[PDB]
Amino acid sequence: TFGRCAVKSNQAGGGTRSHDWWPCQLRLDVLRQFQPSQNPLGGDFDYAEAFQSLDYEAVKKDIAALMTESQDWWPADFGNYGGLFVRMAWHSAGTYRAMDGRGGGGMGQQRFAPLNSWPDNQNLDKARRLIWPIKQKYGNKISWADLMLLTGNVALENMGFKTLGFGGGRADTWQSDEAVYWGAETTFVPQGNDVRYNNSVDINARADKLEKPLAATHMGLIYVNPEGPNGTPDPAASAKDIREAFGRMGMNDTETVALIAGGHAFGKTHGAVKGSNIGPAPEAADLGMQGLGWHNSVGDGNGPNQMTSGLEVIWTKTPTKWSNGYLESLINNNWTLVESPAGAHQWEAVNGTVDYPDPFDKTKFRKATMLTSDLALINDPEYLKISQRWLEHPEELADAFAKAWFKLLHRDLGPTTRYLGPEVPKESFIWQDPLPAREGDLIDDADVDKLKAAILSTDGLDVSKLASTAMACATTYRNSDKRGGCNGARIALEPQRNWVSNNPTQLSAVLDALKKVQSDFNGSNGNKKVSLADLIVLGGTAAVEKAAKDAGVDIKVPFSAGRVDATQEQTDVTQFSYLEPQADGFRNYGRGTARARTEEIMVDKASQLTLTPPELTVLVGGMRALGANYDGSDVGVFTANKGKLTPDFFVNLVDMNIAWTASGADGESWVGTDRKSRSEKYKGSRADLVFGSHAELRAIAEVYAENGNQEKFVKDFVAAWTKVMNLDRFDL
Amino acid sequence: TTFGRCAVKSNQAGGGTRSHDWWPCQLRLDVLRQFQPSQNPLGGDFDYAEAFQSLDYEAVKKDIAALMTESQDWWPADFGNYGGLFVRMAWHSAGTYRAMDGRGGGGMGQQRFAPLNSWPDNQNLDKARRLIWPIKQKYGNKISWADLMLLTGNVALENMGFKTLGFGGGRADTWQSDEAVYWGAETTFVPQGNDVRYNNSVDINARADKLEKPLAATHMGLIYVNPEGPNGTPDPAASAKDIREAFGRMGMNDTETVALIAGGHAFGKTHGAVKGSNIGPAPEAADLGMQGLGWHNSVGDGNGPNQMTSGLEVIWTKTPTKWSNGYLESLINNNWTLVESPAGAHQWEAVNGTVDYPDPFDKTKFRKATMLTSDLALINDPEYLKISQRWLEHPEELADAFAKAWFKLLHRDLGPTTRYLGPEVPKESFIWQDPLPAREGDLIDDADVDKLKAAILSTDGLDVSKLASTAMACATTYRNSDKRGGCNGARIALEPQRNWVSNNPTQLSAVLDALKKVQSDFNGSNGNKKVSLADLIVLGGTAAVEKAAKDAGVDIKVPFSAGRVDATQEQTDVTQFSYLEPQADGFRNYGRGTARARTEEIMVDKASQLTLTPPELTVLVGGMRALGANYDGSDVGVFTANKGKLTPDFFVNLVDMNIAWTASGADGESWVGTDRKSRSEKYKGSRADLVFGSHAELRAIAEVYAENGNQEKFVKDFVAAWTKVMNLDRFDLKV
Ligand code: HEM
Numbered sequence A: 001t002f003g004r005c006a007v008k009s010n011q012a013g014g015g016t017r018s019h020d021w022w023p024c025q026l027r028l029d030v031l032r033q034f035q036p037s038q039n040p041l042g043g044d045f046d047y048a049e050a051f052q053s054l055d056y057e058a059v060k061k062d063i064a065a066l067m068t069e070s071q072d073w074w075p076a077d078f079g080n081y082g083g084l085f086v087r088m089a090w091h092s093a094g095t096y097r098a099m100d101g102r103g104g105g106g107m108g109q110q111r112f113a114p115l116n117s118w119p120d121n122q123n124l125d126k127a128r129r130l131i132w133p134i135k136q137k138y139g140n141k142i143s144w145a146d147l148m149l150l151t152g153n154v155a156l157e158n159m160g161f162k163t164l165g166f167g168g169g170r171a172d173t174w175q176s177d178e179a180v181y182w183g184a185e186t187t188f189v190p191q192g193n194d195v196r197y198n199n200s201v202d203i204n205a206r207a208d209k210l211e212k213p214l215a216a217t218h219m220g221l222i223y224v225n226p227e228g229p230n231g232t233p234d235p236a237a238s239a240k241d242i243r244e245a246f247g248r249m250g251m252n253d254t255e256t257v258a259l260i261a262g263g264h265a266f267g268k269t270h271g272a273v274k275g276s277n278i279g280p281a282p283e284a285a286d287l288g289m290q291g292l293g294w295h296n297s298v299g300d301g302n303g304p305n306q307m308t309s310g311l312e313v314i315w316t317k318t319p320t321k322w323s324n325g326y327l328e329s330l331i332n333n334n335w336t337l338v339e340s341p342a343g344a345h346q347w348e349a350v351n352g353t354v355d356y357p358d359p360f361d362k363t364k365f366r367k368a369t370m371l372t373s374d375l376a377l378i379n380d381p382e383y384l385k386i387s388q389r390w391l392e393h394p395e396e397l398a399d400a401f402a403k404a405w406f407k408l409l410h411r412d413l414g415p416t417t418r419y420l421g422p423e424v425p426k427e428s429f430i431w432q433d434p435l436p437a438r439e440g441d442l443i444d445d446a447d448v449d450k451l452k453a454a455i456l457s458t459d460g461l462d463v464s465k466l467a468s469t470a471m472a473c474a475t476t477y478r479n480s481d482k483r484g485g486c487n488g489a490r491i492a493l494e495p496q497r498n499w500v501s502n503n504p505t506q507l508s509a510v511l512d513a514l515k516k517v518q519s520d521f522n523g524s525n526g527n528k529k530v531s532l533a534d535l536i537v538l539g540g541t542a543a544v545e546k547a548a549k550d551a552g553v554d555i556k557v558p559f560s561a562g563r564v565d566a567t568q569e570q571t572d573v574t575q576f577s578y579l580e581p582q583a584d585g586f587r588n589y590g591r592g593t594a595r596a597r598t599e600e601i602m603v604d605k606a607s608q609l610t611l612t613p614p615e616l617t618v619l620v621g622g623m624r625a626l627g628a629n630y631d632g633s634d635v636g637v638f639t640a641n642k643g644k645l646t647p648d649f650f651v652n653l654v655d656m657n658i659a660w661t662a663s664g665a666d667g668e669s670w671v672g673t674d675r676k677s678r679s680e681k682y683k684g685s686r687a688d689l690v691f692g693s694h695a696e697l698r699a700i701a702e703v704y705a706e707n708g709n710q711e712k713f714v715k716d717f718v719a720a721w722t723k724v725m726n727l728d729r730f731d732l
Numbered sequence B: 001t002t003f004g005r006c007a008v009k010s011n012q013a014g015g016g017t018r019s020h021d022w023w024p025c026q027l028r029l030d031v032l033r034q035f036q037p038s039q040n041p042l043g044g045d046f047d048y049a050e051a052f053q054s055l056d057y058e059a060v061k062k063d064i065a066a067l068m069t070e071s072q073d074w075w076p077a078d079f080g081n082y083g084g085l086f087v088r089m090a091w092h093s094a095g096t097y098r099a100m101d102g103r104g105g106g107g108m109g110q111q112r113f114a115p116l117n118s119w120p121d122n123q124n125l126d127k128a129r130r131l132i133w134p135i136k137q138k139y140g141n142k143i144s145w146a147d148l149m150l151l152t153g154n155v156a157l158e159n160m161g162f163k164t165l166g167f168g169g170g171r172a173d174t175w176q177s178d179e180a181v182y183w184g185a186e187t188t189f190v191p192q193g194n195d196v197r198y199n200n201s202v203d204i205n206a207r208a209d210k211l212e213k214p215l216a217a218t219h220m221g222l223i224y225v226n227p228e229g230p231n232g233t234p235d236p237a238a239s240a241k242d243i244r245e246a247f248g249r250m251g252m253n254d255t256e257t258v259a260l261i262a263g264g265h266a267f268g269k270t271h272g273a274v275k276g277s278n279i280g281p282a283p284e285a286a287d288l289g290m291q292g293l294g295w296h297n298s299v300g301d302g303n304g305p306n307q308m309t310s311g312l313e314v315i316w317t318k319t320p321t322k323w324s325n326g327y328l329e330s331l332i333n334n335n336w337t338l339v340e341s342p343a344g345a346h347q348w349e350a351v352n353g354t355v356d357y358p359d360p361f362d363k364t365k366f367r368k369a370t371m372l373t374s375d376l377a378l379i380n381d382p383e384y385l386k387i388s389q390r391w392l393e394h395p396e397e398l399a400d401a402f403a404k405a406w407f408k409l410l411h412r413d414l415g416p417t418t419r420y421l422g423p424e425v426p427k428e429s430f431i432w433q434d435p436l437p438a439r440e441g442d443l444i445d446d447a448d449v450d451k452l453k454a455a456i457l458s459t460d461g462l463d464v465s466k467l468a469s470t471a472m473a474c475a476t477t478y479r480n481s482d483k484r485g486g487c488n489g490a491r492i493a494l495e496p497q498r499n500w501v502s503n504n505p506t507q508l509s510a511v512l513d514a515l516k517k518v519q520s521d522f523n524g525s526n527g528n529k530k531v532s533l534a535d536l537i538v539l540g541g542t543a544a545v546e547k548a549a550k551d552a553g554v555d556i557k558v559p560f561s562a563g564r565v566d567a568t569q570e571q572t573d574v575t576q577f578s579y580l581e582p583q584a585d586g587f588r589n590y591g592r593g594t595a596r597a598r599t600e601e602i603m604v605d606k607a608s609q610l611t612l613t614p615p616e617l618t619v620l621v622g623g624m625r626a627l628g629a630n631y632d633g634s635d636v637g638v639f640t641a642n643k644g645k646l647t648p649d650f651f652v653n654l655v656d657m658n659i660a661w662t663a664s665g666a667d668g669e670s671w672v673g674t675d676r677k678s679r680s681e682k683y684k685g686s687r688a689d690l691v692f693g694s695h696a697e698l699r700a701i702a703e704v705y706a707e708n709g710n711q712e713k714f715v716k717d718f719v720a721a722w723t724k725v726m727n728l729d730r731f732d733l734k735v
């Protein structure tokens, strides 16, 4: 009954579906998201252009004014929505996972299922509705994705905390991103974590064993449980969860303390009435709620009766003004465990001063309070040292918070060339994967023609190696956080140059050869200079073009010059470790895990490259035709014409005179036997054979295997190649 | 519950708990995101009709005929001839059609995708499709899989001595599983797969006429009926009642039903040589080594004499590769006894019969006559028996009926005659094709259209609201699944549509009289040029939209494509058109849903049949409200003080937080919008209205059109969507 509606609809997709009958079969759903035809702004809409015409300062002015314009349907605590807005922006950005680069604020997904209805996002439906009039006013020129974060940034600045600045540039998305692995649990917090801890309830011991790549301790939470691990009010154990979760989001100890102490300078939690008073979350609510949820039946359900987390904590004596009150209270008070009005565990300074203000009554005051997760920061040796230092040196907290808040909001925005607006911070941060300005003057078409000829006749280079190296560099790109790609020539730097998937000894020979081409060009062409990044892409591109010519198809394969070379200083080894592939179908590398098959990993990667199923399919078949495996093997290379861009991979894959059988125990290797001669003809992988198994992929394989479609195959391959090579070209 | 759940929980490529898992009752927009041009490997600009016109059609047929007797060692041909197998392939491809909702049929070639590639009734048709693949490989883009599967069946019949009426190509391939079809709610396949569709009744005779609408098969995973009898009970009389119900649900009468069954079962045989335990997973569940095939049989080589498909082992005639009257002769002239097949299934044998039915792999070995329970059905029902007895003595009458029924079977979802391609399209026009006449008079030109638009708008009893409402009422009868309905034919003026309560018959009559006056004034006064009522209905709506835009401050060209013709009542069958009558219409705020199909679910289903994207659906509803185009001219959803002007007021007012929305009725269908400051009721809304302010993805679109400054865009988008919908059935126009 989990995942099933009590009433079974017979329209609009109702009825038992293919995925119900065969739930283990590979699904191509993730390659069919975010289609231009589905975007109401149109496929031609240029968000960057719209945003650059935006009256940015006027937007900020209107946001600042909104903060203290209380709306009767959701009255502002202390007459100021600032804290709520900061929470909205920190939950939008706060879903990010550094390992797989998914989550974060970059797609504005908080406004769709499932994030719109996660327990941790309770009442952020109200926050989003409060800023809608600003979205309405400025139209297409500011996205929801940008606006949700800009609102939080402006809120901080209008509560006495100057930030480093801000960068716009997040284009809106138009459907729920159902590609994200948030976990496999079938419940939300307070449950929602049996799978991610492999059924362990040992809260200390399990803390650093959180299922990869997850970055939250329960399904439906941003990071950790505010009442402690599994609701156990043990601050020391909470600190271990915090380090794990924030670390999985790419934040270290300093950053983590700065973000929590920074954030909890502002506003308050809400736990005025028990949860039974609260209606369905937005995705479960009736039409009358018009996109809102968690209707509270006590009074008007708002103001003094607000119920969000079930906790009732006010961290500072000035919740609308930046201060050092969080650390001062945390460290100076004696804490006692108490129940909130809703029944949740929190901490109170029961013999402290009664001077914490009430959000709706200026004559009423409270004692100091904290969450278990706040007390964590003084119940761990490293956090305690940081907290103690910043108690005495609040300027060090302020510096660290400004930097960590900027990172939080912009960690998935991608290269600096994507950042829009008049207050982009000038400092270049390591997590931006920075790139230098170009060297010398840009190569032109005459230079490109000369370079192509040289590259295709240089020691150590050939069509196979050139195509393979270019693709290896390209497929580090992932659209979720806009990291990776060919710009920077980061395949030539650590850690990429020593990834097993890049066949390091072969790679070094290829890069030395391209560096020789570079050295010959640079200094002998006046002030014209070519980057290694451009040479890697041009080499692959020239190889594809010649391979097409050899196959009998004369096509101009386009090349877009202008990539720059990153320095190793700009290329953090830990940050780039996250882009290392477990398997890569384009170069027939690697193997699956106990959780994911090789072909699933391929479809996942394709989705991160924004590829459609035909683009995925044509690229695999072409790479095999080119002999572009990572190790130069013949696995999947079903052709007697290696290096010629024919559809032989598909023709031979679907030849019924070949019988395919498993060879390896692990399911990863397959043999193709000529049924007439009884001799082994081919070796294949799961990435190869899926194209002859899955009914939708095989339908595409058939197109390329059909008589008369040899030129179509080349044209489609060249289009897909160009798309993949240029994914990171935000500079253009 | 393990159903619908993989034992291994993937963490890639969409693995993980999903939104629909948490909130499975929430409206899903999936069906409006299928078949997108980007997903088509041939490209969105691929014109299949142009490709097919250049096909060497005669050569394809010659090659199919050659293939029939070229036995492949991995699936040897029965009697050295794949004809029976190919006829079955084509009759299962076409045989999923349901007349009521127009879904299923062969026109999308969906047998090659899940779930149809793995339905138990399609067992071993994976082999059949693989056998014809070399033909597809040879002819490439110029013949679709959809056309090839059916043409192969047609060519097979003809080469085994049954001349068909002809054939029409024109079915463009599709590129993903169509998950918009309600095949049923059961979580099992045949031999189970039917508790829901009979509402737990197991009385097989009594329940036979009570099959859940719109379903046309007696179990999930079957084409029509169970060949062993209802719920596997070998009672021919009850089987006959299932057959009548199922074939009736597919649009076939008694004569057509007997013709199709007796006609098909002249050929080939069934396969039930070994027990089902020897059979591996269906194609969607099979390992990579099967390369798209399934049902691997572990006995011997799994094929030839060991073939196992349905579990039955029946050979109907003494010449399974040649047209004959052997089926009815055996059926009526033998006495039948209940026996078991080698796989343990119920079938019938003439145990006192001649031992002269040929073995498929030994030309010197023979068997007695056999029949299925579903064959014996044809002599255990009074009406079927009458037909069977007649055709026993007059096989020429069976031949005529089968030729007509087979053509209907293969082409029932192909749409208008103008869609049919190739050199042997039958010349006879059949009622199930919804025929249209040839045009009368020369085609009106741009100047004529401008004159007619001005005439229409200045005609008493015509206004923007009524013109737009009438045009959309006519247009939304279109459905892409079987390419029926639409504005061509002006069938809104004919029965049954002119009396549809959803069309406000009294208002419609007056509107049509006015358009007929415009027609009368034009025709005979403009030389040889004549305009149809169908063109005037669409042009009226189009002029209304143009005027409504102009009245909103926007000068926009609203395209119009002339050339529609007017159908006669004789070309417009009441039964066939009753299937297009809506129970709810979101564009015109008519009607309501039921428990199992909410008002907003019906709207999304309808949108999917119009090929609309979510933005197209959304802009059309909002514009219709702005135009005041409700079926009855009510103010429900008309959230504007500028009714008849094409503005995005619907959206702007819908999302105004000063309005609080509350249910009025008990059934959740009526809503009131109250101004929260003044406490006064301002608006009345339906579920079709309010879903756009509730669903997170639909609301995202509503917001776009509610945004300050997007007035022009709204008008531009409405006009594009209007044009699309008005022209859906214009297969007569090139491109
Ligand atoms: C250990 C990690 C954290 C935990 C467990 C946590 C927990 C919570 C909880 C339970 C609430 C109350 C929600 C409600 O009932 O209204 C809250 C509120 C809030 N949080 Fe955090 N938080 C964390 C980190 C952060 C961070 C990193 C920031 C931003 C930099 C932040 C900013 C805020 C703000 C401003 C509020 C007040 C919202 C309002 O006034 O309505 N928190 N937090």
Ligand code: HEM
Pocket: B078, B083, B084, B085, B087, B088, B091, B224, B225, B226, B227, B243, B260, B261, B263, B264, B265, B267, B268, B269, B270, B271, B272, B308, B309, B310, B311, B312, B374
């Ligand atoms: C009451 C409706 C029908 C039922 C229950 C039914 C049942 C069956 C079954 C169980 C098989 C055996 C599958 C196997 O084991 O290989 C079969 C075979 C076949 N059917 Fe039908 N059938 C029906 C109507 C039709 C129609 C309408 C046609 C086409 C006009 C048709 C044409 C064929 C042919 C040619 C075969 C032989 C396949 C071969 O030789 O491999 N049947 N039928």
